[PDB]
Amino acid sequence: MASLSQASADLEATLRHKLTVMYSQINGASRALDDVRNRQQDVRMTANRKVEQLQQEYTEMKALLDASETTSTRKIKEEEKRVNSKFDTIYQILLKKKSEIQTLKEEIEQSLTKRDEFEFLEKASKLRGISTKPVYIPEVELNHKLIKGIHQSTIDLKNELKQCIGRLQEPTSLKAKVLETFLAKSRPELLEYYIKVILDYNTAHNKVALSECYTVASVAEMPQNYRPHPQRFTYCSQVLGLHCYKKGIHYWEVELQKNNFCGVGICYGSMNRQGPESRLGRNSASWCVEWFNTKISAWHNNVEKTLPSTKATRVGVLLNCDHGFVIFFAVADKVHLMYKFRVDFTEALYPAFWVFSAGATLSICSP
Amino acid sequence: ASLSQASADLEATLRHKLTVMYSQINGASRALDDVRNRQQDVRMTANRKVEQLQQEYTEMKALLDASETTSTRKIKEEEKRVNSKFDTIYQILLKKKSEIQTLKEEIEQSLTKRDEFEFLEKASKLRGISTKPVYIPEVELNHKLIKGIHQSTIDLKNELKQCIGRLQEPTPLKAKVLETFLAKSRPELLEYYIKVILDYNTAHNKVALSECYTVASVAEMPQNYRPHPQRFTYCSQVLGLHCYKKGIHYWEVELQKNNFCGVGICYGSMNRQGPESRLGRNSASWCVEWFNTKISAWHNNVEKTLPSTKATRVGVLLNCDHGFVIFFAVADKVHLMYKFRVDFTEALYPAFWVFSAGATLSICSP
């Protein structure tokens, strides 16, 4: 209700005020980007420290077996040396008795040579009395019971160890023509335009649980208590994708377990996140398909198209920003058709997801 | 009363013994081989039972290499789980950055043309835009799981320690030289040492032999060795393996429970049977003897009742070159028990007697 230079100034002044805050927002993000990569290294070392902590503990056990291994071996070589040393003795005992009898042999063999003599009789009359006797070796048996007992205890230790290792591990003219082409395509042709959808933790409602590198959304039993945020849903149990699309062709698949109270779709970034109006299908900025008591319905702007119920529980969604259509498919083996929308879109679209029945779960597919 | 017939009656029965002695000697030669073969027989049985354990321990070593990698995989999975979520959240933050970077440039572009009237119009829509700062959610590493693996691995170490214990616990001028030798010290006497070996042929049925045949002791039951001419039948005696007729010799004997036992020397000719075989009671045996802890030197049924002594190691010295045998008492120093001055007729074997159920004679090898 005024002038030029003052309006130019009233703009310019409050305009750069936001620019100066955006610097500190962006540098506030840049710090958080660094904190994450630092925190990855922080964990990477904590892994190695707990691994090296086990590499010690296993080497302690490995050395304990090297003790017992030598300790049982010593025992066997002692029993070996005991017996083999007795043979080294008995060999010497026999050896003496041999050369003893070898002498009396030669004493007789020498005396026989001179049978010229009369005193052949005299020199051998004393030799009549000598009478040698044969050698003998006593009972030298190796202790089998002791050596079989060690082996048996060592066999027992192997199957005692096996027991305890288990106890560790066990516990329009062009536009319409292109639509028809895409409507008739097969699963491999649709998968050429794939993009890995990522869930956004900013967007997820308090009772929506996110997991598996933020690719699995499900119903929470308790409120998860995320931070308050403008982009977070306050009324309805909803969550959005990370990336939005205004140019090109896109496709993604979603697996829906316990298909009872859940829904998949697309949404403009402008859609309000708060109040009952934020609910998907009930405004001008959201197109989706939805299950309610296992009855399939396509929704947009408070309008219900009650569809035929289907077997499949993998929903493939295709989007064409170049021409202007979004298509919903049912996938079990083949590609069945659920519904389509013919729209020239105003702005970029984020993928959109809803889940309500305590059990339902939406998962991004990457085949 | 004839020559050639006596020469023949000798010659005939003489070579009969010679021909038997061949078969005796070849009968020994076989036994010499049997022993050395039986040593090898045991030596392989040792290695086979050792190699049998070397397998069994390596089986256990590999079992730990499995669990070691199996628990490590589990930790690296929990690492990758968390680090992959950061790789996501980095991309989530990255989008929110460039999102706000755009609206910055949209505003920075619009400021340049403040010449225009439509500076107001083109930035009136830009008034409403309001960016908000980033946030990182709770990404905490599962400590309970990693401490639990470590605790079970600590438990396995002390479970193993338990069972390694269960392996090992259940298996539990003549006159002038005499005087010189009489005055010698223990190191000088030990220069003429010879390791005495007991002879199993000689030992009486109630005399037990052990420790590579160097320890004689009283048997409780009759040991029932083979019958042999050289074995004692009456008295509890045993002799040495080697006999000595030339040179100087020495040996030490430890006598536990010195009550009814005795040490000495003996000629090979001594008869082993009957009461006469007893050591000290004939012309072929010299010895020292304990009877009710009273020391006596004996030879040919003659007693010299000596002074009782403290020591229980008897050192015996023999001099075949000159002709004397000496008995010493040894505890720390070398005390003298008795001597014999004899020009010996033939070679001497060391000789030993034990009778009190408990007494034990052991050869010392310092």
Author numbering:
A (entry chain B): 188 to 358, 434 to 629
B (entry chain A): 189 to 360, 436 to 629
Quote from the publication.
Tripartite motif (TRIM) family proteins are RING-type E3 ligases that play key regulatory roles in innate immune signalling pathways that lead to the induction of a type I interferon (IFN) response and production of inflammatory cytokines through activation of the IRF3 and NF-κB transcription factors. Activation of RIG-I initiates a signalling cascade that depends on the E3 ligase activity of TRIM25 and induces the production of IFNs and inflammatory cytokines. An example is non-structural protein 1 (NS1) of influenza A viruses (IAV), a multifunctional virulence factor that binds many host proteins during infection, including TRIM2527–29. To understand NS1-mediated inhibition of TRIM25 activity on a molecular level we have determined crystal structures of the CC domain of TRIM25 in complex with NS1-FL and the isolated ED, and of a TRIM25 CC-PRYSPRY fragment, which includes the RIG-I-recognition domain of TRIM25.
The structure of a human TRIM25 CC-PRYSPRY construct (189–630) was determined at 3.6 Å resolution. The CC-PRYSPRY structure has one and a half CC dimers in the asymmetric unit with a crystallographic twofold completing the second dimer. Each bow-shaped CC dimer has two PRYSPRY domains bound towards the ends, maintaining the twofold symmetry. The 73-residue long linker (residues 361–433) connecting the CC and PRYSPRY domain is not visible in the electron density so the exact connectivity is uncertain. The footprint of the PRYSPRY domain on the CC, which corresponds to a total buried surface area of 1433 Å2, spans residues 269–287 on helix α1 and residues 320–326 on the extended connection between α2 and α3, all on the same monomer. These regions contact PRYSPRY domain surface loops spanning residues 460–464 (L1), 472–476 (L2), 488–494 (L3) and 504–506 (L4). Superposition of the NS1-ED and PRYSPRY-bound CC structures shows that the two domains bind at the same position near the end of the CC but on opposite sides such that they would sterically clash only minimally. However, a key observation is that both domains bind to the extended region between helices α2 and α3 (residues 316–331) and strikingly, binding of NS1-ED necessitates a considerable distortion of this region away from its structure in the PRYSPRY-bound or PRYSPRY-unbound CC. Using interface disrupting mutations we show that PRYSPRY domain binding to the CC is required for RIG-I CARD ubiquitination.
